[PDB]
Amino acid sequence: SQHKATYQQHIEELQARTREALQREGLDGLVIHSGQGKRLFLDDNHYPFKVNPQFKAWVPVIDNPNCWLVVNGVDKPTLIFYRPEDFWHKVPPEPNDFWTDSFDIKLLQQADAVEKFLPYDKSRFAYVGEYIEVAKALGFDNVNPDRVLHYLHYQRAYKTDYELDCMREANKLAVAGHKAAEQAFREGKSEFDINLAYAAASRQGDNDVPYTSIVALNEHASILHYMQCDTVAPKESRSFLIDAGANYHGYAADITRTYAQEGVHNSAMFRDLIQAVDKVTLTLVDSLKPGVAYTDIHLLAHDGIAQILHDTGMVNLTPPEIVEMGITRTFFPHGIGHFLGLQVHDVGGLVNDDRGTPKPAPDDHPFLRCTRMVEARQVFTIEPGLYFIDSLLRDLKATPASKYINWDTIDAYKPFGGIRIEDNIIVHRDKNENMTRDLDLNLEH
Amino acid sequence: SQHKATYQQHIEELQARTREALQREGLDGLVIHSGQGKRLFLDDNHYPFKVNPQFKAWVPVIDNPNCWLVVNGVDKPTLIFYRPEDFWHKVPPEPNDFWTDSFDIKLLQQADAVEKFLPYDKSRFAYVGEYIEVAKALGFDNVNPDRVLHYLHYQRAYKTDYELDCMREANKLAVAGHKAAEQAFREGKSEFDINLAYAAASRQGDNDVPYTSIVALNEHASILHYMQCDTVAPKESRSFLIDAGANYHGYAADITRTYAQEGVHNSAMFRDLIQAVDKVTLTLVDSLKPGVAYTDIHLLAHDGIAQILHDTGMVNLTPPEIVEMGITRTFFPHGIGHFLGLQVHDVGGLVNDDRGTPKPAPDDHPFLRCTRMVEARQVFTIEPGLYFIDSLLRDLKATPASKYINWDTIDAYKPFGGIRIEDNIIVHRDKNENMTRDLDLNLEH
Ligand SMILES: [Mn+2]
Ligand SMILES: [Mn+2]
Ligand SMILES: [Mn+2]
Ligand SMILES: [Mn+2]
Ligand code: NI
Ligand code: NI
C-alpha cells in the first residue's frame, strides 16, 4: 500500500549513514553477512537461524543464511542471495518483491562459492557479521569495526517511515495474540495452551517471535524470567502475566499485559492494583517528549510505584520516604523500558554519542537499559511493574525496613504474583503514538 | 513405575562403558559438560539451549546449561548442577527424583565458579563437550578424544532397559500428536495450524521436539526438507505428509505418516499408493532380524519401490530392470532409515567397529545413514518413500530413461507430492517391537 516508496527512501537513508560510517573508519565499503547455519554438537540438527541485525537492517530477508550485502553508500547495493537448487530444497522463484529493484542481486548456489562475488582487494572493506574466522579465511583483516558499529547503532534509534510501518504491523500481530491469550486464561487453560492460543491468533510460532514469551499464571507472574510453560493448569488460575511480541520483516513488538480472574477471592483488589500500574504506564507515556532524559522517566516510574505502595497501605511511609529508603526497588526491580526496533532490546541505549562514549545506568538502577535523550522518530517500551517476589520480600523482611511493611497486605497480594503493563510508543515531534493502545489493547477484552 | 531400578542398572552399564573408554585412552576420568547459553550476534537474546548428548546420556537433565559430570567408571558420578539464585529466576527445589541417588550432587550458583569442583590435576582427565576453548582455559589439554567417543558412540547402538522405556514414552507422545495432525488435515487446516494441533496433543512445542517437523500439504510433500509452514490452507488440500516426533528425557521418536483427503479427484488412487508404501514398511520391519546387514534392508526397499513403479504402470520395465537402470532413485532418493536414540540420526551408523573404522554407504546410495549389522537392543527407523519431485522428474525426462515412464500417470500422482511411512522399531533377540504400530498408529484414524 505504501511500502515500495517508503522502502526506497529507507535505502537512501541507509546509503547516507553508510557513507558517514565508511568515512570515519577510512574504508571503501562493508561486506555484511546474514549468517550461517549452526550445527548442534556431535549432531546433524541445526539451531534456528537468526539473521545478523546489520543485514536485516537493509533488506527483509530474515530466514536465509549465506547471504551477503556489499555496500559503499553510493552504488546500488549488491545482494549475494543464497538459493541452492538441490532436489531436497523448496526452490523459490528468483527474488521479486517491493525491495528487489533496490539491489543488484547475484544468486549463490553453494555457500562456499561466495569468494567469486566478493571484492578482490579486501584491504579497503570491513566484514560485518558473526563469522569472524570465516571472514579471516576469505581475507578480511577488518572485522566489525567499532567506529562503524557505534555510528550505525546510534542512528538505529531514529526510525525511517518504512521502519515505523513495519513496527506498526508487528504491533498488530502481537495485539491479536495478546487478546487470544487473555481469552485462553479466562477459560482456565494451562500456560502451554495459552501460548498456543497466542501463536494461533498472531500467526507466529516459538521461532518466529522476537524473544521467548513469558506466559505466567499466579505466583509465576512474580518470576521476571519465567521460562517454563506448565502443561497442566493450576487448581485455581487467579492471575496471568504475558510478555509476548511478534516480528514483521525483522522488526519487533514487545508487549506485556496482566489480568485478574473473575470470581476468585480478592479478584477485585488485584484488578484494581493492575489498574493503578496501568495508570502509571499511561502517565509515563505522556511524559515522553523530545528533550526529556529517559533516566527521568525511570525515576518518575519509581515515584508512581511509591504512591501505589503508600495508597494501598503496603508501606507505612510517605511516598518520597518509600523512594528514598530504597523500598520501591523490592517491588519494581527492573528498568522502565528501552529502545525497540530490529532488536527487542534495541541498540544504542547506553551511549552518549555516535562514537560510543558510555553513559551507563545509575548504580542504584543497574538494569535500566536506556539513558538517551528522547527525540522524534525514536521507538520505546514503557513497562512499569509491581511484583511480589518471594526472594526479595524475604531479603526485605530481614532488614529494618521490614517494620514499615504491612505483611498481611503483602500476603493478600502475593498469590497473584505480580504486574507489568508494557506499551510500545513512537515519539513524534508534537505527539506520541501509542501503537499498542491504538490497536485497542487495554486491560480486559 | 519401574524407572528407578532400570535407571540404576543403566548407570551400572554406563560406568562399565566408561571404564573401558578410559582404559583405551589412558585416562583417569571424563569431565562432561552439559553446554552453555549461546547469545545472538550483537544481541542479548539467546538460542534455545540444546544439551550435549554425552551429558544427557547419563542423566535426564536436558534444560540446564553449565552442568558438569565427573565420572571415572568406579565411584559414584559427580554432578555439578547449575542452580543460580538471582531474584529473576525460578529457583527449583534441590534435585530430588528417581535419578538423584545415583550422583554426588554439588550445587553451582555461578557458571564461572566451576573450577572449585573440578579436578586439580586435569592431565589425567578429558573434557567432553562443545566449549573447547572454555575447557582449554580451565586447563584441559585432552578434549573430545576420538578413542573415547568412537567407543561410546558404538555402544550407544545397544539401548539399556531404561533407554528402551524412555523411547517407548517418546513414541506415545509423538503418536498422540500424529493422530491430532491427521484430524486437523481433514478439517482443511493450514500447515501452521496442523503443527499447532500436533503441539497441543503431544504437549511438545517447537523447541521441545527433537527435530523440526515436516508438515507438508499437496506438492510440498515432494520436498524432502520442506521447512515452511504456510499459514493459509490451499484451495484444495488433497494430501498431507507429516514427519514429527517427541522427546522423553532426551530420547527421540521420529515418525512419518502420509494421508489422502477424502472426496478429491484421484483420492482413492493416491490412498492406494500410500497403502502400497505402507506394505513395504511392514515387510521391511519383518526383515529386520539379528545378523542382517542394514544395507540389505535398503536394497530390499528399492526392490519394493520398483515393484510399485511396475504395478502402477509408472515405469514400463520389469521390477529388476527398474532397479538396475537406476530409476528407483528418482522416486526414493534417501536412506531406508537409521539408528534412533538420544539423537534422531543416532550415532555409530557408518562405522564397522568401536574404534571408528569407517564403513560408508555405497556410492549409489550416498544418503544411507546406517551400514551396521542388525543386533538385539538396537532401535531403528524404517522409512520407505515414493515421491514426485519436480526437479528429479525433469532430470529424468531429459534422459533416455524418459521413454519408459508413463508421464500421464506421473501427472495424475504429482499434485499429491509424495509418500513416506516411517516407524520406530526395537530389535529383540526373537522378535521386533514396532513401537509405533503398538500405539495403534496405522494409516487412517
Ligand atoms: Mn520490553
Ligand atoms: Mn517485554
Ligand atoms: Mn528418520
Ligand atoms: Mn523422520
Ligand atoms: Ni505498501
Ligand atoms: Ni518407573
Q: Is the separation of the CB atoms in B56 and B342 below 8 Å?
A: yes
Query: What burial class does residue B245 get, using C-beta atoms within 10 Å of its C-beta: 0-12 exposed, 13-18 middle, 19+ buried?
Result: buried
Backbone angles phi, psi at B298, to 5 degrees: -60, -45
A205, A347, A389 ranked by CB distance to B87: nearest:
A389
Residue with cell 538396537: B378
Q: Mark whether A106 and A189 lie in a shared domain.
A: no
Q: How far apart are the CA of A213 and the centre of ligand 1, in A? A: 11
Looking at residue A58, which CATH number applies to its domain? Answer: 3.40.350.10
**Cα gap A312→A289, rounded to integer Å:** 30
CA-CA distance, A282 to A388, in Å (whole number)? Answer: 22
Q: Determine the distance from the C-alpha atom of residue B401 to the mean position of all C-alpha atoms in its chain, rounded to a whole number.
A: 35
> What residue spans of B333-376 are helical by DSSP H?
none
Which of chain A's residues have a Cβ under 8 Å away from the Cβ of B200? 193, 196
Tell whether A293 and A360 lie within a shared domain.
yes
Q: Which three cell numbers stand for residue B444?
A: 487412517
Cell 553510493 maps to which residue? A74
Contacts of A347 in chain B (CB under 8 A): 42
Q: Is the dihedral of CA A83, A84, A90, A93 positive or negative?
A: positive
Show Cβ contacts of residue A383 under 8 Å, excluding neighbours closer than 6 positions: A256, A281, A334, A335, A336, A337, A420, A421, A422, A423
Same domain, A362 and A377: yes
Residue B213 DSSP label: P
Indicate which of B42, B51, B217 best probes the interface with A, i.e. most A CBs within 10 Å of its own CB.
Answer: B42
Residue A274 and residue A417 in contact, taking contact as beta carbons nearer than 8 Å: no
- Shared domain check, B130 and B113: yes
Q: Does A45 sit within 8 Å of B89, measured CB to CB?
A: no
Best residue in A36, A87, A128, A203 for a mutation probing chain B (most B CBs within 10 Å): A87
Give yes or no: residues B120 and B221 share one domain. Answer: no
| Helix pair B267-287, B294-311: axis angle to 10 deg | 150
Contact between residue A277 and residue A385 where contact means Cβ atoms under 8 Å apart? yes
Element of type H or E holding B115: none
Question: Among partner residues A88, A196, A345, which is closest to B44 by beta-carbon distance?
Answer: A345
Cα dist from A3 to A15, A54, A162, A345, B251, whole Å: 18, 20, 7, 25, 47
As residues whose CB is below 5 A from the ion ligand 1, the structure lists: A 254, 381
* Å from CA of A5 to ligand 5 middle: 8
- Tell me the Cα Rg of chain B: 24
C-alpha cell at B91: 529457583
For residue B282, count other CB atoms closer than 10 A to its CB: 16
CA of A421 to the centre of ligand 2 (A): 9
CA separation for the pair A88, A83 (Å, rounded):
12
Cα of A351 from ligand 2 centre, angstroms? 22
Amino acid present at B82: Y
Tell me the three state secondary structure of residue B9: helix
What ligand has the least distance to the C-alpha of B3? 6
Residue B6 CA to ligand 6 centre (angstroms):
8
Domain count of the fold of chain B: 2
Chains A & B: contacts with CB separation below 8 Å:
116
> Which amino acid does the sequence have at B431?
K
**Taking Cα atoms as reference points, which of A305, A311, A261, A245 lies closest to residue A280?**
A305
Residue B43: enclosing H or E segment and its boundaries?
none
* Whole-angstrom distance, CA of residue B374 vs CA of residue B290: 5
Residue B182 to residues B175, B225, B257, B419, Cα–Cα distance (Å): 11, 20, 9, 14
* Domain endpoint, select from A156, A176, A198: A156
CA–CA dist B6, B10 (Å, integer) = 6
Residues B42, A53: C-beta atoms closer than 8 Å:
yes
B211 closest CB neighbour out of A45, A90, A210 = A45
Give the Cα separation of A63 and A91 in Å (integer): 14
CA–CA distances in Å: residue B394 to residues A84, A198, B185, B218: 17, 42, 29, 19
Residues B172, A53: Cα–Cα separation, whole Å: 40
Nearest CA in chain B to A195: B205
Note whether A4 and A112 are same-domain residues. yes
Nearest CB to B53; choose among A42, A90, A212: A42
Distance from CA of B153 to the nearest CA of A (A): 10
What DSSP string runs through B380-427? EEE--EEE--HHHHHHHHTSGGGGGB-HHHHHHHGGG-EEE-BEEEEE
Nearest CA in chain B to A199: B196
Across the interface, whether the CB atoms of B35 and A41 are under 8 A apart is answered yes
Smallest Cβ–Cβ distance between B206 and the set A129, A130, A206 belongs to A206
Cβ-count burial of B363 within 10 angstroms (0-12 exposed, 13-18 middle, 19+ buried)?
exposed
Cβ contact, residue pair A206, B203, below 8 Å? no
Whole-angstrom Cα distance, residue B42 to residue B15?
42
- Burial per residue of A4-35, b for 16 or more beta-carbon CB atoms within 10 angstroms, e otherwise: eebbeebbebbbebbeebbeeeebebbbbbbb
- Quote the ligand 2 centre to A244 CA distance (angstroms): 6
User: In whole angstroms, what is the distance from residue B350 CA to residue B196 CA?
Assistant: 35
CB contact under 8 A, A228 and B90: yes
If asked whether residues B282 and B421 sit together in one domain, one would say yes
Q: Are the C-beta atoms of residues A130 and B41 closer than 8 Å to each other?
A: yes
Residue B4 alpha carbon to ligand 6 centre in Å: 6
DSSP B360: P
Which residue among A119, A141, A156 closes a domain? A156
Is there a contact between A68 and A42 (Cβ–Cβ < 8 Å)? no
Tell me the shortest Cα–Cα distance from A431 to chain B, in angstroms: 30
- Establish how many alpha carbons lie within 13 A of residue B442's alpha carbon, considering only the half-sphere containing its beta carbon: 7
Residue A442 is part of which domain span?
Answer: 157-445
Long-range contacts of B435-441 (CB under 8 A, 24+ apart): B435/B167, B435/B168, B435/B171, B435/B253, B436/B171, B436/B175, B436/B253, B436/B255, B439/B171, B439/B172, B439/B175, B440/B175, B441/B175, B441/B178, B441/B179, B441/B255, B441/B257
CA of residue B142 to ligand 5 center, whole Å: 58
Whether residue B243 sits in one domain with residue B147: no
Contact across the interface for B345 and A43, Cβ inside 8 Å: yes
Reference A20, options A153, A121, A209; nearest CA is: A153
* Whether A190 and A211 share a structural domain: yes
Of B32, B54, B30, B36, the closest CA to residue B111 belongs to: B36
Chain B CB contacts of A391 under 8 Å are: 85, 87, 91
Domain of B346, CATH number, reads 3.90.230.10
Residues in Cβ contact with A326 at an 8 Å cutoff, skipping those fewer than 6 apart: A364, A401
> Which residue do the cell numbers 567407543 mark?
B151
Which residues, other chains included, contact A382 with Cβ-Cβ below 8 Å and sequence gap of 6+?
Answer: A281, A284, A285, A288, A297, A336, A337, A422, A423, A425
Q: Which three cell numbers stand for residue B84?
A: 543460580
A365 and A422 inside one domain? yes
Q: Give the integer Cα–Cα distance in Å for B264 and B238.
A: 6
Q: Which amino acid is at B198?
A: Y
Contact check, Cβ <8 Å, A227/B90: yes
Which residue of chain B comes nearest to A132, CA vs CA?
B41
**Nearest chain A Cα distance for residue B53, angstroms:** 8
**A91 and B391: CB-CB below 8 Å?**
yes
Report the 3 state secondary structure along chain A: CCHHHHHHHHHHHHHHHHHHHHHHHCCCEEEEECCCCCECCCCCCECCCCCCHHHHCCCCCCCCCCCEEEECCCCCCEEEEECCCCCCCCCCCCCCCCCHHHCEEEEECCHHHHHHHCCCCHHHEEEECCCHHHHHHHCCCCECCHHHHHHHHHHCCCCCHHHHHHHHHHHHHHHHHHHHHHHHHHCCCCHHHHHHHHHHHHCCCCCCCCCCCEEEEHHHHHCCCCCCCCCCCCCCCCEEEEEEEEEECCEEEEEEEEEECCCCCCHHHHHHHHHHHHHHHHHHHHHCCCCCEHHHHHHHHHHHHHHHHHHCCCECCCHHHHHHCCCHHHHCCCCCCCECCCCCCCCCCCECCCCCCECCCCCCCCCCCCCCECCCCCEEEECCEEECCHHHHHHHHCCHHHHHECHHHHHHHHHHCEEECEEEEEECCCCEEEHHHHCCCCCCC
Cα–Cα distance measured from residue A50 to residue B38, given in angstroms and rounded to the nearest whole number: 12
Both A244 and A144 in a single domain?
no
CB atoms within 10 A of CB A400: 8
Our measurement of the distance from residue A100's CA atom to the centroid of its chain's CA atoms, rounded to an integer in Å, reads 27
User: What's the grid cell of residue B253?
Assistant: 521418536
> How far is Cα B53 from Cα B74, in angstroms, rounded to an integer?
21
Query: Which chain A residue has its CA at the smallest distance from B346's CA?
Result: A43
Cell matching residue B225: 526438507
Contacts of B220 in chain A (CB under 8 A): 90
- Nearest ligand to the CA atom of A6: 5
What phi, psi does B336 have (nearest 5°)?
Answer: -75, -15
H-assigned helices in B288-416: 294-311, 319-324, 328-331, 390-397, 407-413
Of B156, B190, B213, which one is at a domain's C-terminal end? B156
Tell me, yes or no, whether A299 and A444 share the same domain: yes
